[PDB]
Structures are given as C-alpha cells and as structure tokens.
Amino acid sequence: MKRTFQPSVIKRKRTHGFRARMATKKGRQVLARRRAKGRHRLTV
Amino acid sequence: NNARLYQVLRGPVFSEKSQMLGDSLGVQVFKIDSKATKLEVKKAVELMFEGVEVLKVNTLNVKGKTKRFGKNIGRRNDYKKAYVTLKA
Amino acid sequence: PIVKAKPTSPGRRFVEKVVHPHLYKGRPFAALLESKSKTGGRNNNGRITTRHIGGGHKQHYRIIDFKRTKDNIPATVERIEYDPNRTAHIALLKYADGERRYIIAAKKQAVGDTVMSGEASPIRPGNCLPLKNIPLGTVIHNIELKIGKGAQMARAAGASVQLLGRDGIYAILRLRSGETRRVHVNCRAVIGEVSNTENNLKSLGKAGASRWRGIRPSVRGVAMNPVDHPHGGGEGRNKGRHPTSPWGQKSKGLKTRHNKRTDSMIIRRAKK
RNA sequence: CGGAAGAUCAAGGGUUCCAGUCCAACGUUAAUCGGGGCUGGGUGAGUCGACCCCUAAGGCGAGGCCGAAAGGCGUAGUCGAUGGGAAAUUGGUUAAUAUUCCAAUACUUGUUUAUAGUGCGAUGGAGGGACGGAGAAGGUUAUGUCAGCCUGGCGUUGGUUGUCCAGGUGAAAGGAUGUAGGCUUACAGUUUAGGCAAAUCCGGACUGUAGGCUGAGAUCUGAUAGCAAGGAAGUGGCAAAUACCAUGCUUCCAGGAAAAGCUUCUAAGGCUAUAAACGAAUCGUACCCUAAACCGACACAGGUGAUCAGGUAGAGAAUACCAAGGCGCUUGAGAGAACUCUGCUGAAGGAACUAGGCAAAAUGGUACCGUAACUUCGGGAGAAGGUACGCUGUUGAUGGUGAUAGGUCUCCUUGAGCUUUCGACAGUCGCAGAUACCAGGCUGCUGCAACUGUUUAUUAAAAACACAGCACUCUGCAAACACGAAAGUGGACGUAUAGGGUGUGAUGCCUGCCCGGUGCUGGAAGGUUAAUU
C-alpha cells in the first residue's frame, strides 16, 4: 500500500535544508546543537 | 590570460572510443579542467598544438565512481572531458 | 423568472432556476476585471475563521463603481451582465467620453437608456443623487453611509430602501431589515429597486449545486462529541442544553451588538 | 505476457549501464551466472530539458505597524512552477550516447562591420498573450489491410507452375501552395469631459468612399536518402483513431489564472531594410522506472503520475488467441496416503443445511414481440415472459468512396473496383449456432433513510453524517462571528433576496396544549448592592 515516506527533493530541501534552518532563530539553534554534538550531517 | 590556457588541458583520453574517433573523424579526446568552457578548450587546443584549427568542442562532465577499499567507502574525482573536432 | 426542471433525475426534481434571457451571453469587459482567488474561509494565520467555505467555480472580480462620481456626464447602458460575485445584475455604462464602468443594475433598467449622476439628475432608476435632492417616498438603493465612501447598504438582488423623511442634516430610511435609521443627507443613493428580484425564489435542488457555489457541508452540533461542541454527547439523540454556537454563545435570541459609537444613528427596529 | 510482464519519460535512486575477470560472502539451492567482488570503459546539444525572462498559490519583505524580549504582520519590491515565453527532422553508427556524434536537408536568435533611408526612446498607456463545462456534425492524418511490384520457393504425406507460397518493399522536418472548415465590412478625414501626465496609439462622436485573416490535410518540392539475398522493388484501392483542423463551432450556468515575451503610443531624455563575417555560454543526458535499481527492514504477490497503443474476432483501452518486443517469475527430483487449499463432474432428491440459501449452482448478448401494482407522471422497466440467431446458394433494398467518360487543391451527370447496413427465399449439419472467453437471476409482503454522496486508514458503510428544503434567531457594516497578545486578517473587495449560529431534514398531508422551572427579550416602581468618598 502507500507508505509514509514518499520522497521529494524539493520538499526535503525546502522544509529541512540549510537555508530553511538558517532562516529561523530556532533552526539556527538546531544547527548549533548539531555542531556541538559534532554531527557530520548538519542538514538533509 | 595565457597562464590559464596551460591548465585547461589535463590529459588525453586513451580508450577504444577515443581511438575510434581519432581514426575515423580525427577528433581529440581530452581530460579538461572541471571549470573550463568550450571556448577556453578551443583556445587551449589551438594554442598548445600549433598548426591546427578547431572546428567544434563537445564537452561533458562525468561523475567519479564509488570504489571502496578496506573498511572505507571512498569515491574517485569527478572530471570533465572534451571532444575536439579539427579542421583536417 | 423561475423555471422548474423536469424530474428526469432525482437531483433535478427540485431545481428551480432563475432565468434571465436579457443578460449578456458574452464575456465581461476585460478592462474592468481582476483576478480573485478563494480563501477557503482562512485568514492570514491560515486558520478557518469562516466555516463552510471551500471550492466552487473560478470567478473574476468585476470592478463596480459604487461611488458614482462621474457627475453630469450621461452614460448609456451598453449591456446588462450576470456577476458571479453578487446576486444583483450589473449594468455596463458607456459615458459620453467613452469611459466604461460597471454599476449595480436597477430592476427597471434596460439596455440603451441613459443614467446620470450628480445633483441635477432626473428621478429615474439608475441615477445617483445626494439624499437631499431625492424626494421623500421614492424607492432607492445603494445607500452611502459616509460621504464619498461609496454605496454600502441595499446592494443585494431585490434590495430597496424607503426614504421616509428628513430631520435636519439626516435622512430617515426604512431598511429591509425593518430598521429605521438616519443617514447624512449629503450621502448618495440610487433610484429604484435592485434587479434580480426572484433571487430568493430559486431552489438549488441538490447538494452539488451548493458545492458549485463554494459552500462546504455543515455539521450540526448535536451530531458531534462533547469535545467538539457544547451540543455534543448523549446516548442517542439529545440536546440537553440551551442552544449555543461551537464557542458557547447562545443562538436563540441573544443579541450581539457592541457598537456604542453608532448607537445614535439608529431610530428604531420592528417587532414581529 | 502482449492497454504488458513490450516501449518513452517524470519522480525517486545513483553507476545498478558496457566489457573483461573472479565465486569466498551476497543471491532463500548449485552457479562457470548476476543488479555480488575487482579492474577498465561509457553519458558529446543554439533547436530535448534545466538554467534564463514572466508570473499563481504561497514565502521573505528598505521604510511602516504592532509586540516584555524573542518576535508577529505588512507596502514598494523580491522570490516562488505544477502554468506562459525562440527554433529539426529523417537515416546511419558504439559493447555501451545520440533529435547531442556522422550525412543530408532545415529553422531560431544574436554580435560586429558596411550601404542606404531616418525621430528614437519606458518599469508608463493601449492592444495582444488569454484560457470554463458539456455536446455535435464533419474533413483528415497516424495507422491498418488488400493489392501492385521485387526477391526467393516448387515442399519428407494426397495435391500444389498457380486464381500457388513466403519474405521484402510506402522518407521526415522544412519551403512553396492556400484546400475542407472557422472568423470577418475596409479605408480616408474631422474632432475629443476618457486611458493618473503625453500620444500620430486605443476609447468616444461625427462625414464620404466600396474579398481579407486563420487553417488540418492533399499536391509539388525536399528526394538520385536509407534499407536484403551482394546487387531489387518502392505505387493503387479500401478502412480508419481518443491524435489533428479545434484556444474552432453549438449550447449551458456553476460565468471560466496572472504576468511577461510580442505589436503599437508617446514621457523625461538610436532605429528600419540590405547583406557579409562571426557566434549561441553553463548544467543534465548512462541505466531502472506496473521495478530485483523508487516507497514498503528482503532480489517482498502491495503502492507509484504521464506518454505510445499492431493483428483476427469484438461496441470496446472488456475478453480470447497472436505480432513487434520481452519473458518461463533463483531450489529441484520422485511418489501419487490421510488431511488442507484450489478446481471439475455427480444417481435420486432439491434448502430437508443453517442463526441466515453463507457458499455454490443458476441468469447473462443482439433484435423483435410483450410487460402488473403503484407513481412525484420522470419512472417502475432490462419489470415479468417469449421468439429468432451457424453455414451454403439465390435474391431485393441501401449508405460511403469514387477510376472511366460527357458538360481548375473547382462544379454537375453516369457511374467500374472496394466498402457499409438492413431483408427475403431455398437448402444444409449437429445434442447443442449469443456454441469458447465474455456476459442481469427474478418476484411478493414489510421496517428504516427521500434520493447521488460521506464515515470509524487497520474487526462497525449503517437506520450514523451530509444533503437540497424548512424554521428560529443574530447581524445596519469598522456587521455579527472567527484567528490573533496586538497590529493585521478572514466574513467580503460581500451589504438583510446578505452573512453567522442553531435545530430539523426531498416530497404529500401537516405540526395540538403548557411561559410554572431554566434561558432569551423588553421594563424599572420598589428592595439589596462594589470600588470610591
């Protein structure tokens, strides 16, 4: 049957990407948290 | 400038497609700089192989293959190659 | 007038359509047109603030000249058109200088006759006059409330207002709501009753016809659960409470009028 | 298998593509094989797509508004495709790319130079772009089929040099042309309460004078292309799309994007023809894509948008069998117990089964005849129920196309060949002719809900919800009401024939009594009554 993921690159980069994170104060806190944990993947 | 055309051509391509094209249509296949345009390839070839005139440049980017080694997953460089047709 | 559909289908058995053979069959005057996209009854917060709004046909906005300030330049009625944005018909006006406008078509307004705006204008359907140059007792529509703002009251299909009298700088009007009100005598009104008087005589016939107009279905409060509506709950059918809105506001007589600044402009209301 | 299990994409993936090599692990078995390991290779564009120009919803938003802070909103603008905007087709070629390479023949749009003429210029004005549902009659082509022609064949078994058999064989875009259709008065002059200024442009008002635009297709050219056995053919009939004419036409109401490119006009302050030479960057292009490569933990019976659409039957994109093409679904070998699953047949009986005809069996097509209660006059209804149906010969009528003649993409008459649709008569075979696949079971009484619809994704599809219709009530516009802290919004660029809330729920006949209680509405004489003082 139809499953939950249903990928789309435009939608992925527009809802989770680097610019979408950087465009809000809370997304920048997401990025700061990821950098402090040391993740090799910042954003989708 | 002239110090940019020296770095445009990175090396000839030695393969069966290359050899067939050189034998049949007299076209040269080069590995070129990843940021090089068709006009710079024209100028570079005509500059560095004196006495030849370029007819057409066809270029393409080819992605590098993901080749593992030991416990790692690496990948080869991307690169750009040009097909250069010459006035015979 | 009204025409009944033959009961060829159960969805056609109760269709009573308003039919006007004299309305323009062509397209509206494109210069007086604007794009207009649906809201779904959602505001700038994206929340539904007006329920039961959704879908329907695409429609352009026709720019209606509610103000009528091209005074003392006669206009001829080029055509009478259907307007998807309102219940009334709209008359395309062609002024002596060639400028075209849309106005609300009066009931007794046809193609070819000339309308006038200003103070020295005949008392004929379609003419726009300040309320002080309008004799008492004539039927008017498109009433201004502020001077120069444009017509606000009596604009729907079949609308009419009775000009009862004058008590100084105010004109006394009887509205279709049964409310006697005063309006500044320098405000304007248009002579005649608004066209399409058999609007409320029509019958949609089926649910799809209501959907075509952008009206989504309406779920009764007693058909819900108590977490949704004050009327929700109950084993079987039950009301249990005084009627209220989904926000707890009584719906059976409770008056909801706050405006203390406009209170002195209202003479009285009718009790039936 | 073949409206795919074939082919082209998009999305998504990312090398899975091709070759060589290897078989440990992976592959539900083995594997010499592989979408596995390893090593090489492979994606070529002015015309395809993106980028680019333009904008929709919706974002962000100099200033501005609002808000303890954080922030929220919003104007000018600036982004944002799923939409608008320039242009190529046939053939060949690789192991793997091809509208990209090669060949042939095209097209679009620029820069520079030169020759002439010469008022050019916009983010602004006006045009244009530019648009809905349904339906119908045509004209076509793609395509098919037969023929013609070319090349081979004389058949393991009666016959097969013929009215025989098989295979092959039809070049596009473009340029001319201007057809079937569709639309449609044209010009000149004067003047101007308009198009925010201006206008020679549009709009308006006056006066005389009397085929054009678009357009499928066919035709000509393109065109001595390419294509097999080793050097061949290559043009006629008929049928025919859901594609094209057609963004047409006709109708209807629920009344049908925007902006730019483009054509014109001017405002503040180069352009038009002729060519000649020279350009058209960058990014994608492999491969899967009804899937073993995407989403489902798997090489998972699920899901995944669009495009193409051969033959014989057939109404058909159903169905059956085939073509092109692609596959045999990654354990096999036996045996032929019980029992389980999936099917087929069944004496006599025929619902006795069971909670219940659940399941099964049965019906099933076309034409014609015939068809009850009741009804809102539409229906019910395909009610019910009957008859015919294959093939062969003869024969009547008839639609289309139209060679040949008689009187220039033309018209009129005759009409060969091909083809369509209805009959009649006579015969003939079988148990059976709608012979397979395919393909309504029907009826009587009664409860409920008017009906089409919607719903508990994953045990409930209903009598539940919705519904058109009805009523009550609120709401005079900065409306009531809703979101929000507010600014700002929706309601609505609506205006009481409107909008909100509530109940009820087509329609027919209708809807009695009670205002004590609790609400709601009106009133204020009296009693009580806050901060405050």
Author numbering:
A (entry chain Ba): 1 to 44
B (entry chain Sn): 2 to 89
C (entry chain Cl): 2 to 273
Show me the paper's own sentences about this structure:
Here, by combining cryogenic electron microscopy, genetics and biochemistry, we identify Balon, a new hibernation factor in the cold-adapted bacterium Psychrobacter urativorans. We show that Balon is a distant homologue of the archaeo-eukaryotic translation factor aeRF1 and is found in 20% of representative bacteria. During cold shock or stationary phase, Balon occupies the ribosomal A site in both vacant and actively translating ribosomes in complex with EF-Tu, highlighting an unexpected role for EF-Tu in the cellular stress response. Unlike typical A-site substrates, Balon binds to ribosomes in an mRNA-independent manner, initiating a new mode of ribosome hibernation that can commence while ribosomes are still engaged in protein synthesis.
For the Balon-bound ribosomes, particle classification revealed that nearly two-thirds were also associated with the ribosome hibernation factor RaiA (state 1), whereas another third did not contain RaiA but were instead bound to mRNA and tRNA (state 2). The tRNA-bound ribosomes also contained density in the nascent peptide tunnel, indicating the presence of peptidyl-tRNA. In the mRNA channel, density for mRNA could be observed within the A, P and E sites, with the P-site signal showing a well-defined tRNA–mRNA base pairing that corresponds more to heterogeneous rather than a specific type of tRNA or mRNA sequence. Overall, these data suggested that Balon can associate not only with vacant but also with elongating ribosomes. In the absence of a P-site tRNA (state 1) the lasso loop is poorly ordered, but in the presence of a peptidyl-tRNA (state 2) it is stabilized by contact with the 3′-CCA end of the tRNA. However, when Balon binds to the ribosome, it sequesters this N-terminal tail using a unique loop (absent in other aeRF1-type proteins), which we term the bL27 trap. Therefore, Balon binding to translating ribosomes preserves the catalytic site in its inert state, inaccessible to water molecules.
